[PDB]
Amino acid sequence: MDEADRRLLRRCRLRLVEELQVDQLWDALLSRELFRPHMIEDIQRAGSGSRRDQARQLIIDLETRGSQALPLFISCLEDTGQDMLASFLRTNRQA
Amino acid sequence: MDEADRRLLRRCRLRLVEELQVDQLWDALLSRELFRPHMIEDIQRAGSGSRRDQARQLIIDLETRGSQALPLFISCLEDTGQDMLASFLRTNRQA
Amino acid sequence: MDAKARNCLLQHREALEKDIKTSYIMDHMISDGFLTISEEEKVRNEPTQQQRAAMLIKMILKKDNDSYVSFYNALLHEGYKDLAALLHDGIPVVS
Amino acid sequence: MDAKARNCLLQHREALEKDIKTSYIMDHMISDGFLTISEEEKVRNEPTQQQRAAMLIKMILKKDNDSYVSFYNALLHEGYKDLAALLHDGIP
Amino acid sequence: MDAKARNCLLQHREALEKDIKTSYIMDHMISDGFLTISEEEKVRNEPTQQQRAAMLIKMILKKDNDSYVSFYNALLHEGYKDLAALLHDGIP
Amino acid sequence: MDAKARNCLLQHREALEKDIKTSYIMDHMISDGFLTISEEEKVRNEPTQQQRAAMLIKMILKKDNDSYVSFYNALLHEGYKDLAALLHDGIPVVS
Numbered sequence: 290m291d292e293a294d295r296r297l298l299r300r301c302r303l304r305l306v307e308e309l310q311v312d313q314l315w316d317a318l319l320s321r322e323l324f325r326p327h328m329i330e331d332i333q334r335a336g337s338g339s340r341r342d343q344a345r346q347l348i349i350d351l352e353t354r355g356s357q358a359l360p361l362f363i364s365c366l367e368d369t370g371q372d373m374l375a376s377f378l379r380t381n382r383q384a
Numbered sequence: 385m386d387e388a389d390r391r392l393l394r395r396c397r398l399r400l401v402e403e404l405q406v407d408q409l410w411d412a413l414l415s416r417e418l419f420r421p422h423m424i425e426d427i428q429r430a431g432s433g434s435r436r437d438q439a440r441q442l443i444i445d446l447e448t449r450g451s452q453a454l455p456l457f458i459s460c461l462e463d464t465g466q467d468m469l470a471s472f473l474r475t476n477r478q479a
Numbered sequence: 480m481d482a483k484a485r486n487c488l489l490q491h492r493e494a495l496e497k498d499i500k501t502s503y504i505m506d507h508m509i510s511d512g513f514l515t516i517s518e519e520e521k522v523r524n525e526p527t528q529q530q531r532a533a534m535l536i537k538m539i540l541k542k543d544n545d546s547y548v549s550f551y552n553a554l555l556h557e558g559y560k561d562l563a564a565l566l567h568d569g570i571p572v573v574s
Numbered sequence: 575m576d577a578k579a580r581n582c583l584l585q586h587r588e589a590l591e592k593d594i595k596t597s598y599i600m601d602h603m604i605s606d607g608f609l610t611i612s613e614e615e616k617v618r619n620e621p622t623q624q625q626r627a628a629m630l631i632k633m634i635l636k637k638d639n640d641s642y643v644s645f646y647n648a649l650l651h652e653g654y655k656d657l658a659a660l661l662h663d664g665i666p
Numbered sequence: 667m668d669a670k671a672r673n674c675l676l677q678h679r680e681a682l683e684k685d686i687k688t689s690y691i692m693d694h695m696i697s698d699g700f701l702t703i704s705e706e707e708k709v710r711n712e713p714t715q716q717q718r719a720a721m722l723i724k725m726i727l728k729k730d731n732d733s734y735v736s737f738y739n740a741l742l743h744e745g746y747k748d749l750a751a752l753l754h755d756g757i758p
Numbered sequence: 759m760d761a762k763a764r765n766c767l768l769q770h771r772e773a774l775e776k777d778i779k780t781s782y783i784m785d786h787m788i789s790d791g792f793l794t795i796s797e798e799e800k801v802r803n804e805p806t807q808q809q810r811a812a813m814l815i816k817m818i819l820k821k822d823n824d825s826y827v828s829f830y831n832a833l834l835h836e837g838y839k840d841l842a843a844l845l846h847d848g849i850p851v852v853s
């Protein structure tokens with residue numbers, strides 16, 4: 290992941306952890322080979338296991354999953370009906 | 385693991401977690417195929433990652449590792465020079 | 480799955496539930512494509528290791544031959560030598 | 575659990591919750607035989623020390639008299655002298 | 667940071683440690699750009715809320731004026747009204 | 759290891775250090791017999807993900823052809839497509 294994408298993920302930290310729905314997201318992430326299944330189990334157990342803690346670990350770990358991790362992640366957002374969040378992200382990448 | 389062995393690991397909980405040295409134990413456990421490498425990494429991160437927390441998780445998880453888990457575990461104690469703890473366990477099992 | 484397989488699984492169910500740490504099995508099965516994320520989230524919501532294992536078994540009970548093989552291969556690969564031996568004679572044909 | 579014992583626990587559940595490192599205490603109760611691995615895991619699952627302690631107390635409230643004495647002895651042997659005294663009176 | 671700022675932090679470090687949920691506060695500081703992912707991980711490694719909070723304070727103590735303001739803003743925005751007031755005077 | 763392999767690692771070291779989550783690599787390498795427990799403990803002792811990756815690579819640079827392959831395979835197997843691609847041309851002949 291390039292520095293600009295990483296920086297984007299940090300800038301949107303608050304919004305991501307506040308709004309990301311994860312339970313519905315795992316299938317999408319798998320389909321696009323963003324994470325291996327055990328990686329997902331680890332993220333699921335991050336911290337207290339709340340939605341927020343999972344979300345946070347997801348987006349941190351996301352930075353390590355490749356050059357195209359960010360656009361692929363936006364797509365998974367789209368695929369799971371999180372258009373608003375995906376929209377917030379995209380309009381930054383472009384910005 | 386049979387009920388008598390499980391009971392043993394419980395009875396000896398306090399002594400195991402007080403005295404078990406884990407850093408030197410991993411190679412033994414692997415040689416006897418008691419745990420897979422990733423299980424070891426997980427046990428290493430149990431709780432605070434203290435010797436005691438690792439040790440506690442180790443012995444809890446030990447209960448699930450088979451019919452010969454206890455005797456094999458005792459052998460690994462002996463392998464790593466923890467003979468006093470191994471003897472403590474040993475004597476209990478026969479009693 | 481074939482009756483031979485289901486029956487074998489049912490016969491050795493309690494042993495399976497006692498020992499299985501699902502986090503080391505569900506990953507393989509998800510990789511293999513014979514367990515759903517939704518099923519995995521359901522399992523994960525059980526508070527204890529044995530309850531997790533129990534749920535997992537119920538789910539596998541209702542599944543196909545390829546699934547039993549997936550499960551067995553995971554058990555074998557994760558060092559559950561004893562458990563795998565119990566299911567061995569229950570393995571069915573696959574293509 | 576006896577009545578006076580159960581009540582003395584309820585009485586000091588807050589002070590208990592605040593101070594105890596549940597993992598050490600459960601180590602003792604596991605060894606004594608008054609806590610199961612399954613129950614211990616239930617406790618461990620709780621995301622904070624206070625919640626861990628709270629869960630432990632919740633469970634102990636539903637246990638027998640020996641369970642209380644096990645708990646009492648756990649506190650004593652781990653150096654929670656003051657906490658132990660509070661509970662001393664309730665000893666079935 | 668300025669001397670007054672640092673000193674202000676020292677004066678209230680204890681009150682801060684006891685109360686703050688570090689993960690929320692770090693969420694803000696990450697967003698603001700005044701904390702790195704590696705620093706965040708360092709903090710999270712600590713085995714208790716207090717040690718997590720303590721570590722964060724230690725790191726902040728070595729950061730610039732903007733970092734102090736990020737921290738103050740995090741407190742305010744997460745509803746730590748009282749704690750925010752304590753550091754208000756020290757805002758560089 | 760061969761100079762080709764080693765120089766390939768050196769060239770891409772920074773990318774590797776930024777992304778590698780060691781807990782998903784060290785396991786494979788230990789299973790394969792090309793990473794030791796004590797090396798893994800030395801890695802684990804680093805406080806951050808990138809520091810752990812850095813340590814692991816330090817260790818690997820000193821190892822043989824098989825080890826490089828072990829590393830590469832684990833990378834590929836754990837979904838680090840881009841990272842494996844960087845290391846592909848540096849793969850040494852083995853066995």
Ligand SMILES: [Cl-]
Nearest residue numbers: 610611612613
């Ligand atoms: Cl149990």
Ligand SMILES: [Cl-]
Nearest residue numbers: 702703704705
């Ligand atoms: Cl960083």
